[PDB]
Amino acid sequence: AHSQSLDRLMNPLIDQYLYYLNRTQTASGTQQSRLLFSQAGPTSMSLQAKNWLPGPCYRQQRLSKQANDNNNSNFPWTGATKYHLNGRDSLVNPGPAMASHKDD
Amino acid sequence: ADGVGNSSGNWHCDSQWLGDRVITTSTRTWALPTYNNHLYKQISSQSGATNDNHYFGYSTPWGYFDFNRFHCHFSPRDWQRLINNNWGFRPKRLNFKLFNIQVKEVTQNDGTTTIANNLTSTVQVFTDSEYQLPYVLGSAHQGCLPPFPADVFMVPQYGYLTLNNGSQAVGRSSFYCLEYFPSQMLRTGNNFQFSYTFEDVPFHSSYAHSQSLDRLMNPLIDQYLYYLNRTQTASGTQQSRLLFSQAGPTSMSLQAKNWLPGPCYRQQRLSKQANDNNNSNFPWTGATKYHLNGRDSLVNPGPAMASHKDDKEKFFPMHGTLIFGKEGTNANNADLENVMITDEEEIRTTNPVATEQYGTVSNNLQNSNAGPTTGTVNHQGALPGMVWQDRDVYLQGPIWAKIPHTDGHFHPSPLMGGFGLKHPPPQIMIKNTPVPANPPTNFSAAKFASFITQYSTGQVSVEIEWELQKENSKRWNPEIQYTSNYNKSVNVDFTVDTNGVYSEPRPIGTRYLTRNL
Amino acid sequence: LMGGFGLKHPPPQIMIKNTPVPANPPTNFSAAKFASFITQYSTGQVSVEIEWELQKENSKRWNPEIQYTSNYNKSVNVDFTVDTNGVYSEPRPIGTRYLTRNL
Ligand SMILES: Nc1ncnc2c1ncn2[C@H]1C[C@H](O)[C@@H](COP(=O)(O)O)O1
Numbered sequence: 001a002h003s004q005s006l007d008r009l010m011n012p013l014i015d016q017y018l019y020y021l022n023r024t025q026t027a028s029g030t031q032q033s034r035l036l037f038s039q040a041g042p043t044s045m046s047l048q049a050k051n052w053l054p055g056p057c058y059r060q061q062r063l064s065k066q067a068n069d070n071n072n073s074n075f076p077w078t079g080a081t082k083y084h085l086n087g088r089d090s091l092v093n094p095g096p097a098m099a100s101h102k103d104d
Numbered sequence: 105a106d107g108v109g110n111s112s113g114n115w116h117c118d119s120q121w122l123g124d125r126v127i128t129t130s131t132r133t134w135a136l137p138t139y140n141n142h143l144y145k146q147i148s149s150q151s152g153a154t155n156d157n158h159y160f161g162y163s164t165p166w167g168y169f170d171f172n173r174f175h176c177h178f179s180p181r182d183w184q185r186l187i188n189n190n191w192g193f194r195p196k197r198l199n200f201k202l203f204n205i206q207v208k209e210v211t212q213n214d215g216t217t218t219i220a221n222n223l224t225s226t227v228q229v230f231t232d233s234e235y236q237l238p239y240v241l242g243s244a245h246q247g248c249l250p251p252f253p254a255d256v257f258m259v260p261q262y263g264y265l266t267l268n269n270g271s272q273a274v275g276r277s278s279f280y281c282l283e284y285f286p287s288q289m290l291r292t293g294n295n296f297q298f299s300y301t302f303e304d305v306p307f308h309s310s311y312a313h314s315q316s317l318d319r320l321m322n323p324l325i326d327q328y329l330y331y332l333n334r335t336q337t338a339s340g341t342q343q344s345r346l347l348f349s350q351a352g353p354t355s356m357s358l359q360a361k362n363w364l365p366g367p368c369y370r371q372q373r374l375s376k377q378a379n380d381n382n383n384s385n386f387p388w389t390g391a392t393k394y395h396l397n398g399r400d401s402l403v404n405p406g407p408a409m410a411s412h413k414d415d416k417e418k419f420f421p422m423h424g425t426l427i428f429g430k431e432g433t434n435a436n437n438a439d440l441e442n443v444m445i446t447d448e449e450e451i452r453t454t455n456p457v458a459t460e461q462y463g464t465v466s467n468n469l470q471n472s473n474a475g476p477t478t479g480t481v482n483h484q485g486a487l488p489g490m491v492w493q494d495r496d497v498y499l500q501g502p503i504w505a506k507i508p509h510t511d512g513h514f515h516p517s518p519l520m521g522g523f524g525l526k527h528p529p530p531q532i533m534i535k536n537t538p539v540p541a542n543p544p545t546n547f548s549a550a551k552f553a554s555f556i557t558q559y560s561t562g563q564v565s566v567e568i569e570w571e572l573q574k575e576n577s578k579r580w581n582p583e584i585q586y587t588s589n590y591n592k593s594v595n596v597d598f599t600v601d602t603n604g605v606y607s608e609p610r611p612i613g614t615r616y617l618t619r620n621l
Numbered sequence: 622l623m624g625g626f627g628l629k630h631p632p633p634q635i636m637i638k639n640t641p642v643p644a645n646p647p648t649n650f651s652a653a654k655f656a657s658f659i660t661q662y663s664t665g666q667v668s669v670e671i672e673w674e675l676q677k678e679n680s681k682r683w684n685p686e687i688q689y690t691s692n693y694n695k696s697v698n699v700d701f702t703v704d705t706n707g708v709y710s711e712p713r714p715i716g717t718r719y720l721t722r723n724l
């Protein structure tokens with residue numbers, strides 16, 4: 001298993017030399033359209049430039065193990081994710097590799 | 105094996121052109137402080153940060169050397185030679201040296217500082233050959249060798265991130281003690297060296313295409329393949345009928361074609377002219393972003409896509425290009441005039457426009473009763489028969505990145521630019537060996553917090569051998585070249601000013617020479 | 622036109638400078654360039670050895686030629702010599718043309 005997230009490969013100490021667009025609007029005074037740029041750094045990591053993208057996704061429905069949390073209706077077939085091949089629907093099972101759940 | 109009074113190396117900055125290859129050398133002076141009092145410290149995002157910005161990691165006393173920017177290795181003139189005369193270039197092998205090390209001890213008495221040579225003090229250097237440490241190089245951080253040889257730079261501190269949950273740390277979080285790697289210890293008179301050889305990697309494209317992807321046809325000749333010209337009768341009472349025709353010079357858009365444009369993931373469009381853009385704040389809200397483990401992250405700059413369509417120079421995609429600051433620019437809220445926004449325009453011929461949809465698809469099944477409706481595709485993954493160009497490399501910009509070790513990678517070319525490498529040039533780590541201050545005269549098992557304040561300086565050389573791909577073109581008319589403006593000016597471009605400050609006025613891409621598809 | 626030997630490949634230029642030595646860097650990384658240097662200078666020794674080729678006088682001239690001579694008369698200072706305060710001085714410019722040849 002990996003010891004790093006894909007978006008965290010950065011050096012947390014050092015600030016980038018590449019600018020990003022911080023503000024599309026003036027900060028103070030009468031609100032006005034203006035373009036403002038900044039170097040992304042330790043404080044905001046989500047904004048930095050990155051070399052890589054996550055793997056491809058084909059989305060799944062989410063179920064809850066705790067009883068009574070899931071919706072009340074029968075949808076294994078109807079609400080599922082499925083591929084349509086030669087006029088026949090078929091479930092995508094288990095499907096492309098995708099993490100089962102997010103943090104916590 | 106030299107001693108105090110013998111220089112351990114010489115200054116080599118030159119570049120030499122063999123015409124098959126170019127060998128570019130850069131020698132610079134550096135200064136390494138003592139980071140965070142010789143201590144490994146964990147670092148984590150402050151609580152109250154947004155979910156997306158949390159991190160957990162470790163900051164180390166070690167520094168490191170990064171030459172990963174191009175202008176480290178190329179002068180603006182050497183860059184001009186390359187991009188003008190060549191269709192492609194790739195790195196072959198590099199050679200690295202540290203020499204003329206000096207370790208200075210610093211005392212402070214009242215308001216006066218005193219710096220003196222510590223002749224017996226040591227500096228530690230190891231290269232990570234086996235890629236066992238986190239690799240922070242390809243993230244386009246500051247701290248690379250300066251553009252201009254006469255500058256002295258400060259060695260950046262090494263720290264790394266690992267898994268987190270919120271701001272806390274899951275049990276898989278790795279801690280790496282760099283003091284656990286065999287490292288060479290140097291005094292004044294000792295020098296460090298290693299060699300490296302790049303793995304086979306595709307040449308970068310130094311060319312722009314002379315043809316659009318959809319124009320590869322012979323304009324004179326008519327096809328033998330029919331297409332559907334009319335779904336309805338031309339004259340008289342309108343009636344459903346199917347009519348076919350051979351596509352030809354008059355209508356090119358209708359012809360059969362063998363290839364499709366590269367994959368698109370769409371960008372928002374911004375206008376450089378003030379007051380043309382919407383009035384609201386949407387860098388974060390209206391952006392294009394990927395959602396990974398419950399955290400949103402911008403797609404920046406993103407898949408290579410043309411910046412703008414024909415005759416629309418003013419607009420640029422939001423978060424879709426590399427942006428460089430002009431000299432003296434603030435790191436916070438710089439005006440549009442201060443930044444330098446790069447342009448991908450050369451890739452129009454294949455890649456889609458970053459701000460435009462990929463195309464259109466039909467979302468229903470027609471019949472006599474239900475008219476055909478069609479959906480708009482704003483994102484498209486790879487389809488058989490796609491062709492695309494990679495993003496261009498600039499004079500200042502990433503040379504390489506490390507392809508993450510994973511089960512699968514698709515077209516592993518860094519999205520900022522450059523050469524994707526599975527075994528990138530190793531990380532060179534450096535720190536000042538701790539020197540204690542006077543211990544107590546009675547044994548205490550507590551750890552020393554008392555150290556002699558000191559730093560070290562020295563010289564660093566990087567010699568990379570670049571392989572070139574010559575222009576074979578038969579093009580009759582003159583190609584575009586990168587030229588300096590002839591008109592007079594107060595300052596000369598790519599030159600120091602009156603105050604001694606080196607500045608780069610514009611980003612320079614590598615794509616000038618033209619090839620056919 | 623000032624004088625001497627026109628050369629297409631004249632003796633090369635010898636350049637010298639003191640390698641910069643930084644002063645104590647900050648303890649937190651900053652990408653700004655160092656303005657803080659240790660003030661220092663260097664001294665040393667320099668030798669220049671040139672080998673000059675000569676062309677001898679072949680003349681048949683009977684009578685004595687002009688030569689460059691020092692004045693015999695007494696003086697407070699001697700020409701081309703330090704003074705009481707240690708200052709070297711050259712009293713007059715000396716051209717090279719004394720010996721005579723025919724056209
Ligand atoms: N930047 C980069 N690094 C590594 N591998 C890459 C890169 N870009 C593409 N590829 C892969 C996918 C290409 O079809 C193939 C060309 O390898 P060739 O050498 O041309 O035979 O290599």
Ligand SMILES: Nc1ncnc2c1ncn2[C@H]1C[C@H](O)[C@@H](COP(=O)(O)O)O1
Nearest residue numbers: 622623624625626627628629630631676
């Ligand atoms: N100062 C100086 N440098 C170089 N060339 C000169 C100079 N003066 C004259 N010339 C040229 C023109 C002369 O006719 C010729 C004599 O070269 P000779 O060697 O005598 O055959 O060389």
